[PDB]
Short mmCIF file of C-alpha atoms and ligand atoms in Angstrom, two decimals:
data_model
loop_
_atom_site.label_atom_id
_atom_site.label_comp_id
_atom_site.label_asym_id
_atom_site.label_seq_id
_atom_site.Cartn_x
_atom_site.Cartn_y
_atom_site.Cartn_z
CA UNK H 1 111.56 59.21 150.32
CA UNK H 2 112.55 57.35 147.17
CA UNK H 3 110.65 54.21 148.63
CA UNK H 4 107.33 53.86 150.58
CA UNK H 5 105.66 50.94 151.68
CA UNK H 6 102.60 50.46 153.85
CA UNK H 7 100.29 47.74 154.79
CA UNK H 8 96.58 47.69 156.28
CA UNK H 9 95.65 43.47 156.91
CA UNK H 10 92.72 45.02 158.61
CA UNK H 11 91.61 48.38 159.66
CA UNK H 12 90.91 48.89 163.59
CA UNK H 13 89.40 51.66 164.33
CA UNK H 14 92.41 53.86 165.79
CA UNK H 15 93.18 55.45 162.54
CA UNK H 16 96.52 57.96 162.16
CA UNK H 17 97.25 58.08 158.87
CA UNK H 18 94.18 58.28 156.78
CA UNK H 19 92.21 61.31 155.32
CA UNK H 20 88.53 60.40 155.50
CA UNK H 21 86.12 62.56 153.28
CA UNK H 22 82.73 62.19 153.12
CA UNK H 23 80.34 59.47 154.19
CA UNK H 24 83.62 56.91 154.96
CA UNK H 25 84.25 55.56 158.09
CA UNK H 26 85.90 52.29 160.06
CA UNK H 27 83.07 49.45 161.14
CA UNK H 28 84.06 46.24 162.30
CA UNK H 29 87.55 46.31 161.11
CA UNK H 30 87.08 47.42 157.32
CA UNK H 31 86.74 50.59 155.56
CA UNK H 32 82.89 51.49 155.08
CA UNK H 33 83.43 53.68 152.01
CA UNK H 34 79.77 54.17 151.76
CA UNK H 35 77.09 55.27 154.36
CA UNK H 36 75.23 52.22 156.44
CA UNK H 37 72.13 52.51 158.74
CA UNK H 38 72.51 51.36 162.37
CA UNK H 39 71.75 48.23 161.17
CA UNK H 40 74.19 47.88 158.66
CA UNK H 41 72.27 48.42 155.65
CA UNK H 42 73.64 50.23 152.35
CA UNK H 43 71.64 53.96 151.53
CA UNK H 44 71.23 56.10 149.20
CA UNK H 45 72.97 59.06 148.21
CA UNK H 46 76.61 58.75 149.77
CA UNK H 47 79.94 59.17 148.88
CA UNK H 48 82.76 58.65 150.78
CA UNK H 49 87.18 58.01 150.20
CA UNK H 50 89.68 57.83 152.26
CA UNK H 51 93.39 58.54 151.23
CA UNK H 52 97.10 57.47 153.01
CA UNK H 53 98.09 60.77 154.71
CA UNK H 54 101.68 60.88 153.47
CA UNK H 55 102.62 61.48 150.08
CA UNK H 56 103.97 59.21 147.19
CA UNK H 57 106.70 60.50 144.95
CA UNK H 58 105.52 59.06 141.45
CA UNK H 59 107.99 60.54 139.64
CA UNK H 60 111.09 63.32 139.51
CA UNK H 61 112.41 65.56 137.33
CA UNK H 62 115.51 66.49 137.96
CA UNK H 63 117.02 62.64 138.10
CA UNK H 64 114.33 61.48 135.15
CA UNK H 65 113.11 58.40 137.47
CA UNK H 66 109.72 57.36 137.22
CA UNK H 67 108.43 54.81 140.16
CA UNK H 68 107.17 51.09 140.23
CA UNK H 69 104.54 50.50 142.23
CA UNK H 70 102.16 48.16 143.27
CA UNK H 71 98.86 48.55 145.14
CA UNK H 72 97.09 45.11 146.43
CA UNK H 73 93.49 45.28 148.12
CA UNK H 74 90.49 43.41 148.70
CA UNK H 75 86.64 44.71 149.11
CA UNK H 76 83.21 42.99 148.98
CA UNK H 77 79.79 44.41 147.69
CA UNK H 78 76.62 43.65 149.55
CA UNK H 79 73.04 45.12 148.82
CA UNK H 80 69.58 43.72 149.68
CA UNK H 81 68.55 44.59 146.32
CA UNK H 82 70.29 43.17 142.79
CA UNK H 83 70.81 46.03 140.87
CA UNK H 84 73.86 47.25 143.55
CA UNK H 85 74.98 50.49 142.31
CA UNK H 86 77.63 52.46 141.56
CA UNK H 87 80.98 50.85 142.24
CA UNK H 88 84.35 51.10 143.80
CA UNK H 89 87.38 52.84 142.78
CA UNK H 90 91.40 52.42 143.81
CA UNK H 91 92.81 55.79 142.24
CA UNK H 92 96.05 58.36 142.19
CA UNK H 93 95.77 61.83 142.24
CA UNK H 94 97.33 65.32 143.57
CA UNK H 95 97.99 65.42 147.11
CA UNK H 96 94.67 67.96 147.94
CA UNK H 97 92.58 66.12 145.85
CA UNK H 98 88.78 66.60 147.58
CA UNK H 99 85.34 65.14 146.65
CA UNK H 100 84.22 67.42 144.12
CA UNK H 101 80.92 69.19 143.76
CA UNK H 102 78.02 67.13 142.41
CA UNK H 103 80.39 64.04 142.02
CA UNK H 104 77.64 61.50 143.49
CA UNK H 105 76.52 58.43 141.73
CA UNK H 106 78.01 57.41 139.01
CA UNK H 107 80.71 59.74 139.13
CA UNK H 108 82.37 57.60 141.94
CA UNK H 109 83.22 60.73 143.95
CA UNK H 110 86.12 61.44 141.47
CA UNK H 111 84.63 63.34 138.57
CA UNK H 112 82.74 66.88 138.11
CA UNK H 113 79.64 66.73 136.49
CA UNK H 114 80.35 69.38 134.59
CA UNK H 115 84.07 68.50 132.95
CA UNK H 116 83.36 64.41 133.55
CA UNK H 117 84.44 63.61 130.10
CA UNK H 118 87.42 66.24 129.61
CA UNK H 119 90.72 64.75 129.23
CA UNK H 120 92.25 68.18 130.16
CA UNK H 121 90.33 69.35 132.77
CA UNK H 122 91.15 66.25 135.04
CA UNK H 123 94.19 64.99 137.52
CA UNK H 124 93.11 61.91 138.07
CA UNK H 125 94.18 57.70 137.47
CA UNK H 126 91.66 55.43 138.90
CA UNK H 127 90.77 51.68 138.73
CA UNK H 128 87.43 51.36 139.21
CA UNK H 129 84.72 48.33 139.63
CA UNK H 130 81.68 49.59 137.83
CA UNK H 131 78.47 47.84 138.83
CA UNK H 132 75.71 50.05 137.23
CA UNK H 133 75.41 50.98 133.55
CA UNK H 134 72.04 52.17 132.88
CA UNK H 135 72.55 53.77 129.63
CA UNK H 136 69.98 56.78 130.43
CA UNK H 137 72.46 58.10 133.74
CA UNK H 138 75.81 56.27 133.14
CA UNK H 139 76.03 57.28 129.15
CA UNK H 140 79.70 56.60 129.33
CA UNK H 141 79.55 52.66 130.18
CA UNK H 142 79.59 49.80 128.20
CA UNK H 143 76.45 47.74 128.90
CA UNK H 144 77.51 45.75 131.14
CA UNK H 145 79.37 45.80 134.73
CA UNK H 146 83.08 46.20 134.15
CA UNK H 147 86.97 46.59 135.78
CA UNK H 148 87.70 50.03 134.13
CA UNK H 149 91.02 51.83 133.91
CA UNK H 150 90.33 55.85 134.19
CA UNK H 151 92.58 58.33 133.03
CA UNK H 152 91.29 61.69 133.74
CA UNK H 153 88.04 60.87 132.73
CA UNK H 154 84.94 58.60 133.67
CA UNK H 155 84.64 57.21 130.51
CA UNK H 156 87.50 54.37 130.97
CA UNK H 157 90.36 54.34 128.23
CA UNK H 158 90.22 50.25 128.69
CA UNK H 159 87.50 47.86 130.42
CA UNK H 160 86.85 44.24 130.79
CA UNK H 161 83.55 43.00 131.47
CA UNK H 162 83.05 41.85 135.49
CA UNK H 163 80.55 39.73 137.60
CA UNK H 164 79.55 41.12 140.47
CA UNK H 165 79.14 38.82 143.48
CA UNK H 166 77.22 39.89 146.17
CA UNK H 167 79.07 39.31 149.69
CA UNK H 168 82.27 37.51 148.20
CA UNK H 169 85.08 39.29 148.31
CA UNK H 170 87.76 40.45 145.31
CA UNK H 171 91.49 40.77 145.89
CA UNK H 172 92.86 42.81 143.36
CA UNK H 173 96.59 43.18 142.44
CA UNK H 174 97.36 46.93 140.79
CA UNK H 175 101.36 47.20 139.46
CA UNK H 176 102.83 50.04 137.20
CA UNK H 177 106.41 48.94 135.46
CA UNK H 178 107.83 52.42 134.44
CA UNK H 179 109.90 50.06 131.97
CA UNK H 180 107.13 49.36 129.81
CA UNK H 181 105.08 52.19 131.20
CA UNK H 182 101.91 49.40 131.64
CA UNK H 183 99.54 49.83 134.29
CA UNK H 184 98.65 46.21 134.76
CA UNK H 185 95.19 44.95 137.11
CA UNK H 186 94.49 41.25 137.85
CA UNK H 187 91.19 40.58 140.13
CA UNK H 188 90.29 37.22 141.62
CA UNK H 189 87.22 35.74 143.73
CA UNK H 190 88.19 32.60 145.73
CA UNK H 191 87.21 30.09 143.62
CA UNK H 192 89.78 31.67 140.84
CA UNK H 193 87.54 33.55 138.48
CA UNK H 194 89.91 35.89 137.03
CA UNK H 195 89.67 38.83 135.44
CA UNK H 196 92.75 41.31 133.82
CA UNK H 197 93.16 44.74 132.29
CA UNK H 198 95.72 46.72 131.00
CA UNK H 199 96.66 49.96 129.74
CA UNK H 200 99.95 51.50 128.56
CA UNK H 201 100.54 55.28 130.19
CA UNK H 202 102.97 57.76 130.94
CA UNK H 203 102.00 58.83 134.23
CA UNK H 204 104.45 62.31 134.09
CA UNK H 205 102.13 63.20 131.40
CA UNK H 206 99.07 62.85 133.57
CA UNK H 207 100.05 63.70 137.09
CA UNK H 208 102.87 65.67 139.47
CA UNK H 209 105.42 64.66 140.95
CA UNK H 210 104.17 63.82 144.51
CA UNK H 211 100.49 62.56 144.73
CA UNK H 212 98.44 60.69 147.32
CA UNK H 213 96.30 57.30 146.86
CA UNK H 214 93.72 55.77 148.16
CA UNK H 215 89.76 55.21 147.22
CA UNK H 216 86.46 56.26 146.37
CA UNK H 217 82.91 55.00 146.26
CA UNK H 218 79.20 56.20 145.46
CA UNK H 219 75.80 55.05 146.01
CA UNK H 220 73.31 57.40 143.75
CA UNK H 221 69.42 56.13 143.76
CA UNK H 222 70.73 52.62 144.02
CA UNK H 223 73.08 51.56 146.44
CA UNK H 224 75.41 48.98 148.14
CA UNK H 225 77.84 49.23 150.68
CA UNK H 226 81.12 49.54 149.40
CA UNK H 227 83.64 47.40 152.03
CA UNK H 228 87.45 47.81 151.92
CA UNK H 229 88.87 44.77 154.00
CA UNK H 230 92.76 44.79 153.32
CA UNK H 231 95.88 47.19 151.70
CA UNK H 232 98.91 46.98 150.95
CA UNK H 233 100.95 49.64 148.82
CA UNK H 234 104.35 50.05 147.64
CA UNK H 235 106.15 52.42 145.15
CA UNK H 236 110.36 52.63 144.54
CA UNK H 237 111.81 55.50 142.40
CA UNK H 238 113.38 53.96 139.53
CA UNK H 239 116.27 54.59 136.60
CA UNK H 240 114.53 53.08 133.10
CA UNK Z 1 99.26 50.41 159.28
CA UNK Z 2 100.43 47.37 160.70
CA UNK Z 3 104.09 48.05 158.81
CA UNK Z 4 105.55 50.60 157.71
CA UNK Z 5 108.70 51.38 155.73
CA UNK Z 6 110.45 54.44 154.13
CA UNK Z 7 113.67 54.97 152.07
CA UNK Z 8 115.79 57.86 152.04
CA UNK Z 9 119.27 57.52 150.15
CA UNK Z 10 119.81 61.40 149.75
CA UNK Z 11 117.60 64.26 150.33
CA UNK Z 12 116.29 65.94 147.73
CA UNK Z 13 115.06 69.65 148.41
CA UNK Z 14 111.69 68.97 147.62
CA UNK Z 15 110.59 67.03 150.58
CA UNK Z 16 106.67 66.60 151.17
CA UNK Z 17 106.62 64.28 153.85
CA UNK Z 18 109.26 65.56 156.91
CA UNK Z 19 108.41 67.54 159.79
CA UNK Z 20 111.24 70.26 160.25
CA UNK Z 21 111.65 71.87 163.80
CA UNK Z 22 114.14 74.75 164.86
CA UNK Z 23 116.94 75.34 162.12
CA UNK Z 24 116.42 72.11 160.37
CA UNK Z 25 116.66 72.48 156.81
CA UNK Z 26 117.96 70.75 153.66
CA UNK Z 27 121.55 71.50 151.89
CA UNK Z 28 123.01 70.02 148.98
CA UNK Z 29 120.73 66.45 149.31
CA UNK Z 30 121.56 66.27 152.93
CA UNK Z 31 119.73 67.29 156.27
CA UNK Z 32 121.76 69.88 158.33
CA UNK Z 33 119.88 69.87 161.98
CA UNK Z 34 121.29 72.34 162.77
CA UNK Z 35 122.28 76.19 161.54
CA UNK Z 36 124.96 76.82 159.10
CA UNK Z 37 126.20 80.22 157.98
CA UNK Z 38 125.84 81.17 154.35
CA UNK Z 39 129.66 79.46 154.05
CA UNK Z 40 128.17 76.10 155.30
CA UNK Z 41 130.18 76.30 158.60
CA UNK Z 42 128.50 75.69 162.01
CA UNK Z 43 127.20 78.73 164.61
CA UNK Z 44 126.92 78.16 168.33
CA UNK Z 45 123.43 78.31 169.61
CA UNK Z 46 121.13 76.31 167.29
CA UNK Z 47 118.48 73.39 167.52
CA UNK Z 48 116.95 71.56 164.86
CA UNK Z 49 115.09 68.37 164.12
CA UNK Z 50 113.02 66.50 161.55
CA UNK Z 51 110.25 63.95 162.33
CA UNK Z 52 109.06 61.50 159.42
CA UNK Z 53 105.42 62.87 158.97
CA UNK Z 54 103.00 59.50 159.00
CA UNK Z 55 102.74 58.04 162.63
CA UNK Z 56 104.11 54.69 163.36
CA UNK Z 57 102.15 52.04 165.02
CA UNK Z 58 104.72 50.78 167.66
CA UNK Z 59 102.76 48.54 170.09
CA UNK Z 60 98.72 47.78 169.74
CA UNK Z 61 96.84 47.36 173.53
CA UNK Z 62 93.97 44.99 172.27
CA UNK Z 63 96.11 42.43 170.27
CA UNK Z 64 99.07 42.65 172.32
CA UNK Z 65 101.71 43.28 169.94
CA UNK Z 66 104.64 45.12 169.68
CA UNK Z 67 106.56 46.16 166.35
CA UNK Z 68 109.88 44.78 165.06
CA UNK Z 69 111.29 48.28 164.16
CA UNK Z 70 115.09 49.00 162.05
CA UNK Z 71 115.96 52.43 161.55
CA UNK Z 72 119.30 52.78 159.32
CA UNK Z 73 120.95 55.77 158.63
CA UNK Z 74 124.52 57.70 157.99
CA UNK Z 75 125.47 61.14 159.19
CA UNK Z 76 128.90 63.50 159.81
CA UNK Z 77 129.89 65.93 162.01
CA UNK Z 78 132.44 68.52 161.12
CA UNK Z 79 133.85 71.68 162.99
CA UNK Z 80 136.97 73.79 163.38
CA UNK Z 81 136.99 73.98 166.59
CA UNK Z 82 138.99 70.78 169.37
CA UNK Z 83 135.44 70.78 171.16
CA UNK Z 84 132.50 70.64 168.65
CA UNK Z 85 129.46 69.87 170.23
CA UNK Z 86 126.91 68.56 171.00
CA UNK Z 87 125.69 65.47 168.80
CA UNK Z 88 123.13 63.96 166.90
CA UNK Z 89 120.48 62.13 167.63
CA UNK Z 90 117.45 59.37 166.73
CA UNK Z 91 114.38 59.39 169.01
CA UNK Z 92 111.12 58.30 168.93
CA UNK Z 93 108.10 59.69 171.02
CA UNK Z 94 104.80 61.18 170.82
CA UNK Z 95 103.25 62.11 167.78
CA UNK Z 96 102.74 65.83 169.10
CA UNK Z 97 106.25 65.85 170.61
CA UNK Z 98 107.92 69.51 169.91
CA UNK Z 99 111.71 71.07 171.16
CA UNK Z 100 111.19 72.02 174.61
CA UNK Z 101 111.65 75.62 175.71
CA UNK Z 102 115.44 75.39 176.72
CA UNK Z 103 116.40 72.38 175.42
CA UNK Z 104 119.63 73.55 173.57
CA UNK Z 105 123.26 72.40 173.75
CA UNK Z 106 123.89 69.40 176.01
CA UNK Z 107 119.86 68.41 176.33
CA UNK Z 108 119.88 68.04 172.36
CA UNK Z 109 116.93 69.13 172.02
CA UNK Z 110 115.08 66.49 173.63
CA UNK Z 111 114.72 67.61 176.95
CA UNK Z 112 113.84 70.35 179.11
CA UNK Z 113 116.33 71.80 181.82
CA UNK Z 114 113.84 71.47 184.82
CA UNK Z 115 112.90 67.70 184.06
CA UNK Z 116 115.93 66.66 181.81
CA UNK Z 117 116.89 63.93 184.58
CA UNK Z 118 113.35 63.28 186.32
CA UNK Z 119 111.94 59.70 183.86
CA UNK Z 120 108.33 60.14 185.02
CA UNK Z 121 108.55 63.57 183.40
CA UNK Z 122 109.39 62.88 180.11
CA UNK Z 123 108.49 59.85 177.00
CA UNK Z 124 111.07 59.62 175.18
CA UNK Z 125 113.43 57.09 173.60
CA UNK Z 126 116.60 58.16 172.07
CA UNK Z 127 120.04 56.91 170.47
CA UNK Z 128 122.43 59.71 171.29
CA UNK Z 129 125.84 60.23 169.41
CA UNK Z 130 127.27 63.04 172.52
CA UNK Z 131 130.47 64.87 171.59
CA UNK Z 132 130.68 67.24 174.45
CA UNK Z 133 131.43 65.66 177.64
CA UNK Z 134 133.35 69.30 180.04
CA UNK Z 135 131.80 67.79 183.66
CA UNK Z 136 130.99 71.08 184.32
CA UNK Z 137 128.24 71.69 181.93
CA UNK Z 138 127.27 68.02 180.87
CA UNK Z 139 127.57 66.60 184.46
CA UNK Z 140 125.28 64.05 183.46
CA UNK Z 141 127.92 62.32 180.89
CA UNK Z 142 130.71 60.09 181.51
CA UNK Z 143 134.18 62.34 180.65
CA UNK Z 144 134.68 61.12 176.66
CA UNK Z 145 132.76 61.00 173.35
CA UNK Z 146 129.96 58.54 173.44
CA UNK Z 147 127.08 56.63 171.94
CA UNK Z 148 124.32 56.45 174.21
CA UNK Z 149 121.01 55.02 174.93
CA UNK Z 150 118.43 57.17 176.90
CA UNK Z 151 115.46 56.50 178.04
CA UNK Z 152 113.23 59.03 179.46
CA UNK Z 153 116.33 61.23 180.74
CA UNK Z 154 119.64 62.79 179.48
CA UNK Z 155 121.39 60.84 181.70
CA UNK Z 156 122.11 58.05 179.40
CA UNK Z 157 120.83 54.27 180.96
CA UNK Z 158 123.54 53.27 179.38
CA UNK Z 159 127.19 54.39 177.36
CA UNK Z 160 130.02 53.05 175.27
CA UNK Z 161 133.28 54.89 174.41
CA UNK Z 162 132.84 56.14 170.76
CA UNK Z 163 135.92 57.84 168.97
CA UNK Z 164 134.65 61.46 167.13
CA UNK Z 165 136.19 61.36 163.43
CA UNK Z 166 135.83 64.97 161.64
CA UNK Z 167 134.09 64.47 158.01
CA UNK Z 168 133.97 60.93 157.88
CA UNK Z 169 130.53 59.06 157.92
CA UNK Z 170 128.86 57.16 160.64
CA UNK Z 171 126.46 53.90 159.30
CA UNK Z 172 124.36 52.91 161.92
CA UNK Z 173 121.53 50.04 162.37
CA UNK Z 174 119.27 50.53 165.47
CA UNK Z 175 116.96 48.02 165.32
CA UNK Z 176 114.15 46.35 168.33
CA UNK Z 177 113.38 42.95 168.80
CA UNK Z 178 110.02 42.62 170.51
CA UNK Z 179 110.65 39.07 171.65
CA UNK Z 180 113.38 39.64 173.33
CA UNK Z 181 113.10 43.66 174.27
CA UNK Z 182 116.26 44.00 172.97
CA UNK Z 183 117.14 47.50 171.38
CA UNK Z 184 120.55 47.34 169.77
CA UNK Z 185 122.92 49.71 168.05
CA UNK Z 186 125.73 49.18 165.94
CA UNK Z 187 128.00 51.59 164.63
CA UNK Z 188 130.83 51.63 162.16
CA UNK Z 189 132.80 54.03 160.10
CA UNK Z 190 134.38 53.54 156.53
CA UNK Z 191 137.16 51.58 157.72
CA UNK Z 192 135.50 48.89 159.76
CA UNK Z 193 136.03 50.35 163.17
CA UNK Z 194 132.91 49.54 164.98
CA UNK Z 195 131.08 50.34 168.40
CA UNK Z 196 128.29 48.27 169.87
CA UNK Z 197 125.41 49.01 172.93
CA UNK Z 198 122.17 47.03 173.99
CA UNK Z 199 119.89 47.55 176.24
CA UNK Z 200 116.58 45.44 177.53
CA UNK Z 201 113.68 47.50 177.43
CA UNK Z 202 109.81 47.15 177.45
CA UNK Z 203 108.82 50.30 175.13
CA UNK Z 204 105.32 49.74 175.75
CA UNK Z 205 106.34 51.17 179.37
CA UNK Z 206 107.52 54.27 177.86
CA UNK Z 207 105.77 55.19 174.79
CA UNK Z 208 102.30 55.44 173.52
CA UNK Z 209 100.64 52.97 171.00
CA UNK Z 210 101.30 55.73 168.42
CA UNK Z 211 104.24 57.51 167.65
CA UNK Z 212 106.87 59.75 165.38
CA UNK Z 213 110.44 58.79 164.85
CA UNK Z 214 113.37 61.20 163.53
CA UNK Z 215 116.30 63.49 164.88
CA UNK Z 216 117.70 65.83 166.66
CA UNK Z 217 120.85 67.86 167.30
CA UNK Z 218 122.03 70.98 169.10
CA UNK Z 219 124.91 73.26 169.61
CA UNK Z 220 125.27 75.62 172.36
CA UNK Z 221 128.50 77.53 173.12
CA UNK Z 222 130.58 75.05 171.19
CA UNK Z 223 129.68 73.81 167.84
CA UNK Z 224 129.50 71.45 164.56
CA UNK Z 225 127.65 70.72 162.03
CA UNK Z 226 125.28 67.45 161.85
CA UNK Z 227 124.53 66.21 159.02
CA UNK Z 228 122.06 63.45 158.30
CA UNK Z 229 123.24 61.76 154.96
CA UNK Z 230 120.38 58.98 154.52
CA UNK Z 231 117.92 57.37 156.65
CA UNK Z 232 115.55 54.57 156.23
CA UNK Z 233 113.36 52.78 158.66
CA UNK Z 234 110.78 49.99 159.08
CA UNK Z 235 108.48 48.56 161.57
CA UNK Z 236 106.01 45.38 161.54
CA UNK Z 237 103.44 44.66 164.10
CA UNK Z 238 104.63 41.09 165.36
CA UNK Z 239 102.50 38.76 167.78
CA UNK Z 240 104.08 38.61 171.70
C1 MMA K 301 69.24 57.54 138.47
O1 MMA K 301 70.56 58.08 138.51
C2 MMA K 301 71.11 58.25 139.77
O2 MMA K 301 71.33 56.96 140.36
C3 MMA K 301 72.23 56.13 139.59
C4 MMA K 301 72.32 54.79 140.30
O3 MMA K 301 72.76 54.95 141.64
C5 MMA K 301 73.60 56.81 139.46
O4 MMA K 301 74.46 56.01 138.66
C6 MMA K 301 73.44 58.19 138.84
O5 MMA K 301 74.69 58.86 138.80
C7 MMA K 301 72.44 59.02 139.65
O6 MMA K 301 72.96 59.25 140.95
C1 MMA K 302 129.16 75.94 178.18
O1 MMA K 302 127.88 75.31 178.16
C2 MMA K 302 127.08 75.57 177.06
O2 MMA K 302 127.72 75.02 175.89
C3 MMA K 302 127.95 73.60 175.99
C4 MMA K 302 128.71 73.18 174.73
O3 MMA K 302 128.02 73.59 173.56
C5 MMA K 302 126.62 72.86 176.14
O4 MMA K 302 126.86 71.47 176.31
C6 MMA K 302 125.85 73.39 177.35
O5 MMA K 302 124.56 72.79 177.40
C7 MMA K 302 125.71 74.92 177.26
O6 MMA K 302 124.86 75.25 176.17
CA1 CA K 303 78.68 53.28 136.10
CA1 CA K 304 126.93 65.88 176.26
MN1 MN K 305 82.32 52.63 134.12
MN1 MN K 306 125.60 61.96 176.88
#
């Protein structure tokens, strides 16, 4: 289809169209990206994602259209500790696209230890909401927790520093205008703390033609649960 | 998803996210259900039909809704023959739903011969544009061309007289109103000839919570091509 559109206000737990890998699962009407104990608690050590079953045509060849699209979402952090670690990311990437080996912590679930920082090894856009930056583990971050915009690589190509609020929840607005080519994220709390970032790429250099979205979380030695409330996505082939 | 929505103005060969059954397949941007010789003319005994791949929520048990649905969508018959047969179709029903063994030529591949008539056999909802009507075969069908609604059996709940124009596209707009349980259809070809049907129905009587939309079309002794020309389709979840 040259148009797809799909909306989750909530997310019962009769599921049909979503690929769950790893730890995720639905709780109480929300995505639990993370592993929780029976009481609800955030542990250590998980990673989970979870990814719309049918596939998004970004962009095709033959008629040179590239598509506008537009991904809104909100998700809340909690943790009994402070120090909530390692963050939540919205990201694009080829349709069989699997947790890969070793990808815990702060690798999100999207990156390979091993080829982490390599541009060309990658296939892989992601927005993510970095909460931990301890320079000895997380070498890459700035020092300080950050909105980051990924392009095949953990190290962000563009970041804005973030406050993370335990409990309150973030609705975040995600657009790409293949006119300008500008990958554009706004994020607000409630009370209208705003925060925006935004980075200029050509997606047809970075991924195929059809790919699949959806998101990714980690909890390494520290943790948090990682709570996706609401989505909405939508993405129309377009002549620029 | 609560809604859903999907745009197809042409098809493109390289389709990711349609479910082909039988002879189904794509030719020059356009879905022909059903087999075509290397010269692009019809052949008698063929079945084919395409399903959109991601599930649609139609009705939800513990809120007690029931989705607003419009599937739109243009499509042309052609054959050499006075008597091409046997039509086209749009159904919905169960996600697992496959052609049943038999189910050729005047069942349109939506029903089986043994059961084709019996309603608590089968789950099925289905717009049928019939072109075959010889009472000795199709005993089920009033004796001319017609658009049909069926519910559950071949033996339309209700027809209207439709005229069968070689070549020339049909637009049609199926759509369900929840509130009222109306399903309506409304047909027209390029010159503003038009053909209307409604009928009351409950769906949440004859469906699952869950299911797949698409086509189907057959030809059994007599044939014609069916070609789909562009389809697109959207439900909401809306409060009863
Ligand atoms: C101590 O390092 C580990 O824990 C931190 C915090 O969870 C992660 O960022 C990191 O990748 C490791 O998994
Ligand atoms: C002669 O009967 C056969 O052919 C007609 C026309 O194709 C079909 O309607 C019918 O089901 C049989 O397959
Ligand atoms: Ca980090
Ligand atoms: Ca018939
Ligand atoms: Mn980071
Ligand atoms: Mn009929």
């Amino acid at each position: 289809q040259d148009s797809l559109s799909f909306g989750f206000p909530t997310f019962p737990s009769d599921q049909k169209n979503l690929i769950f890998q790893g730890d995720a699962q639905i709780k109480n009407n929300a995505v639990q990206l993370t592993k929780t104990d029976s009481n609800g608690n955030p542990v250590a050590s998980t990673v989970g994602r979870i990814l719309f079953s049918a596939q998004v045509h970004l962009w095709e060849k033959s008629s040179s259209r590239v598509a506008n699209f537009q991904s809104q979402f909100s998700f809340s952090l909690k943790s009994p500790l402070s120090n909530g670690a390692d963050g939540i990311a919205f990201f694009i990437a080829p349709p069989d696209t699997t947790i890969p080996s070793g990808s815990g912590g702060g690798l999100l679930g999207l990156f390979a230890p091993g080829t982490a920082q390599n541009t060309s090894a990658n296939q892989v856009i992601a927005v993510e909401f970095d909460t931990f930056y301890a320079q000895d583990s997380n070498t890459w971050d700035p020092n300080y927790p950050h909105i980051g915009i990924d392009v095949n690589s953990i190290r962000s190509v563009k970041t804005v520093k973030w406050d993370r609020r335990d409990g309150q929840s973030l609705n975040v607005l995600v657009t790409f205008n293949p006119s300008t080519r500008n990958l554009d994220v706004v994020a607000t709390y409630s009370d209208g703390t705003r925060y925006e970032v935004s980075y200029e790429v050509d997606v047809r250099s970075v991924l195929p033609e059809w790919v699949r979205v959806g998101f990714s979380a980690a909890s390494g030695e520290q943790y948090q649960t990682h709570t996706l409330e609401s989505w909405s996505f939508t993405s129309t082939l377009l002549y620029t």
